[PDB]
Design a protein around this nucleic acid. Structure first.
Ligand SMILES: [Mg+2]
Ligand SMILES: [Mg+2]
Ligand SMILES: [Mg+2]
Ligand SMILES: [Mg+2]
Ligand SMILES: [Mg+2]
Lengths: 117, 55, 54, 151
RNA sequence: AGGCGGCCCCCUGGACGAAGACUGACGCUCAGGUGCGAAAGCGUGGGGAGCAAACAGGAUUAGAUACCCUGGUAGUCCACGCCGUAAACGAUGUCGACUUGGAGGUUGUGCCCUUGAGGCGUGGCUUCCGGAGCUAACGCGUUAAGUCGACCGCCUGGGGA
């Protein structure tokens, strides 16, 4: 259904997880897959490899719109920051631009206490 | 430095993402770094320079 | 920071990662994952001055 | 090997064909120092492999070996309390030995009546890459490429 | 001193420097007195996004009234007022004089083809080294823990306190 051909891959990479969301330029959600989705739990979910298959599974439910060019928006640290883009480029995609969008407060909200592990 | 309106001179002292470049990298005298950041701060309030690459 | 270009690429990424090493992203997120007491951030600053003497 | 690296002993060639390579094979297949009985199972399997393959004897062996040869593998590593699996590009010399060792191991884990028959059907299976040992090559790639991420 | 960090304005304290005029010992210290004084805390009324004692729940453990996690109330913010204590520390009371040095950082002022982003000096601050001396030693060392003087505070075994 419908046609897009020019989209954007939003990847949220936290330490416990990473989430891939595909979208049009406007920001309307086209498809999404996460690492915890494709099996993997706890110790395995938080790996670049688990992030890789998320990226693979996401392209297997969006080319219904037939995307062909996109930009990348990297949010968060952890794994699947870097490996996710690679799997994307190989799925048959000319990747145009990469930009980091991890949010940075100008020192606003106080974060939680340090963990005494 | 001699003025926040010199966005031409000022652009040389910010990064690709609009962050103030420290005196270390620029090797600017220590008194003027301040004059510089205060003039960059003035230019930001007035929308003559961005705070972030975002906008 | 930001990145695009060249007909012969997909290695722009090596650029992108070296751009983030330059920008201090991952370093910055670690710094803020958890609150640091002011006394503590004062304590961090001294230790590195000392090491920055050869 | 903390400090002292070494060269490798370069065993004599096979008595029948004069190949160091097949001599490396009998040793891998040999058991309890029964050399006398070791070359007996390897040759007779080649005589069975030769006829049934037709295509010479020396080349027939490699075609099967061309397959089970593994290009990459993974090396365990313990960094911050975690056993990461780091995939290393493995050298040619060892590459054949693995090919040889997995071929030998799958033969005993086979149903046939004797060792010559187990061995022959393993080479034949491998020549078509459709046996136990090739799957060991495939698991190595499946296990590799997973940790393609680290390098 | 406690402490003060986005930009702008209004009010206001102190510090340094150049140049010369003015006063003419007006100084130093200070028991008692007075004022200031982080954080938590208390009173009333605001406020309340994050964070978070208490508390609840989930885990861990032999136990786990904890460390981890999900939540989360005072509290953390404002106003006015109380409390007056901290490893309130340089664990070094104030002032004033004197005694080799080297590398810096900060900020004033004189001189020099401003002919350079400097060359010569001369102030106040400050960092790290380091001589003499001092020290039980570690260390300190022109910002003294050296050399002397004025004056205040305080110490007199540990515990009990
Ligand atoms: Mg209150
Ligand atoms: Mg908690
Ligand atoms: Mg006391
Ligand atoms: Mg010293
Ligand atoms: Mg003195």
């Amino acid at each position: 259904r419908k046609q897009v051909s020019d989209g954007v891959a939003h990847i949220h990479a936290s330490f416990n997880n990473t989430i891939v969301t595909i979208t049009d330029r406007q920001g309307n959600a086209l498809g999404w897959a996460t690492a915890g989705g494709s099996g993997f739990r706890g110790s395995r979910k938080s790996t670049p490899f688990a992030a890789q298959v998320a990226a693979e599974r996401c392209a297997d439910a969006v080319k219904e719109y037939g995307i062909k060019n996109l930009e990348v928006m990297v949010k968060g640290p952890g794994p699947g920051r870097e490996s996710t883009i690679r799997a994307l480029n190989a799925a048959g995609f000319r990747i145009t631009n990469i930009t980091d969008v991890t949010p940075i407060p100008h020192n606003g909200c106080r974060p939680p206490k340090k963990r005494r592990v | 430095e001699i003025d926040y309106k010199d966005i031409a001179t000022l652009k040389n002292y910010i990064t690709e993402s609009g962050k103030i470049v420290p005196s270390r990298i620029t090797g600017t005298r220590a008194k003027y770094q301040r004059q510089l950041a205060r003039a960059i701060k003035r230019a930001r309030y007035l929308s003559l320079l961005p705070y972030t690459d975002r906008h | 920071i930001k990145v695009r270009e060249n007909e012969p690429f997909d290695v722009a990424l090596r650029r992108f990662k070296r751009s983030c090493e330059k920008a201090g992203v991952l370093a910055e997120v670690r710094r803020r994952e958890f609150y640091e007491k002011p006394t503590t951030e004062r304590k961090r600053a001294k230790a590195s001055a000392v090491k920055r003497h050869a | 090997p903390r400090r002292r690296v070494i060269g490798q002993r370069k065993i004599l060639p096979d008595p029948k064909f004069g190949s160091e390579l097949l001599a490396k094979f009998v040793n891998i297949l040999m058991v309890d120092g029964k050399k006398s009985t070791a070359e007996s199972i390897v040759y007779s399997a080649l005589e069975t492999l030769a006829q049934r393959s037709g295509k010479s004897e020396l080349e027939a062996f490699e075609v099967a070996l061309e397959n089970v040869r593994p290009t990459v593998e993974v090396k365990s590593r313990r960094v911050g309390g975690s056993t990461y699996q780091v995939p290393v590009e493995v050298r040619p010399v060892r590459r054949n030995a693995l090919a040889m060792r997995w071929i030998v191991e799958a033969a005993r884990k086979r149903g046939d009546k004797s060792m010559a028959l187990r061995l022959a059907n393993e080479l034949s299976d491998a020549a078509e890459n459709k046996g136990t040992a090739v799957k060991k090559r495939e698991d190595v790639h499946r296990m590799a490429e997973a940790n393609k991420a680290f390098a």
